[PDB]
Amino acid sequence: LKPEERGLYLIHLLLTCANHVASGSLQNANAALEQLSHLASPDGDTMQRIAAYFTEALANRILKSWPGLYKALNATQTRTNNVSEEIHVRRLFFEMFPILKVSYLLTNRAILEAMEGEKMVHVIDLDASEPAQWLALLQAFNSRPEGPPHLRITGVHHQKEVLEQMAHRLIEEAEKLDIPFQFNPVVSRLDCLNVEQLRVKTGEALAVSSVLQLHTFLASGRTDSFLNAIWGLSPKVMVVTEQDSDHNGSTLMERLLESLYTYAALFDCLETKVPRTSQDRIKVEKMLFGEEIKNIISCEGFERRERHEKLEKWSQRIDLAGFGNVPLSYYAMLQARRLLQGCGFDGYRIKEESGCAVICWQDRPLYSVSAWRCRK
């Protein structure tokens, strides 16, 4: 058993295995799967890790051919009330990757721009799970020469614990900055959220922010209904941070090949700068990246929610809802390039696709941030 040749070999194994599941019986699928399992480790090479999570991904898809075994195997997992680990993974991604640090700086720089001269400010956060994005806002609002404005934030998440956690950290910081500030927590999933029902106090200025939360509507016109509902509030700006990869092919093959291209790039960052034995590395791959991969491969239909698409398809879709593009500023983009120079983050680079920011890793695009103005 010799290494780098196994790298190519593993790839061929995933394709050969996937073709049997997609077309025909598992007898030949089991062949490559056993062949894969001896060669893939969660703690080894980058391609060893990659094949560790795709192999289990295809197995789950095979299990769904027999609902009996799948349901029976997943029969003792109900008493699950663990959010403390869930927030731990969100903090790791925040710290170990600049994806969110760049997005947060970019949206707040974009939000500040549309809110010049506004005494009242309303921000809506879909999947408001990380407070540090707004911690930067309160700082910057107080930093501007005019002075802080009255600030309301609406937090959207499916867990009251996180919203209670965000309010506390947010309200305390506001009072210490002498900012009039109000947190309005709404507890609901994103499918069931009604945007129009949301309280709007007139005389306000509205801003909407969606961090990696738009593509879940492509599962369930579920998207176009939602964007128009945001349009119905007349937002000054809507900033959309979204993933920039074609992971929503119709077939398993087209979905698989492009999927591992992207996740291979993400796993490279982790090997380049993190020890292989660190639990933190293992906790993001298995619990964050590896969960995504399972949804892209094992799941299909409405229960498959990753559905990431490239920046172009998002631009058209957003445009169709009567949204105008706001080019991101030259000096907000300089700062993101400045974030990516320091704090390790070697190899990351950002480019501009038509007034929208694209974050890439060694010329492989990963995530896109775009600013949008409400047309008409």
């Binding site: 780098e4 790298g7 190519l8 790839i11 796993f267 060694q362 492989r364």
Partner: peptide, 14 residues
């Protein structure tokens, strides 16, 4: 490193 991203690059050409 010897890129894992490069590993698929050479295998996709084949």
């Amino acid at each position: 490193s010897m890129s894992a991203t490069a590993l698929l690059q050479k295998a996709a050409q084949m």
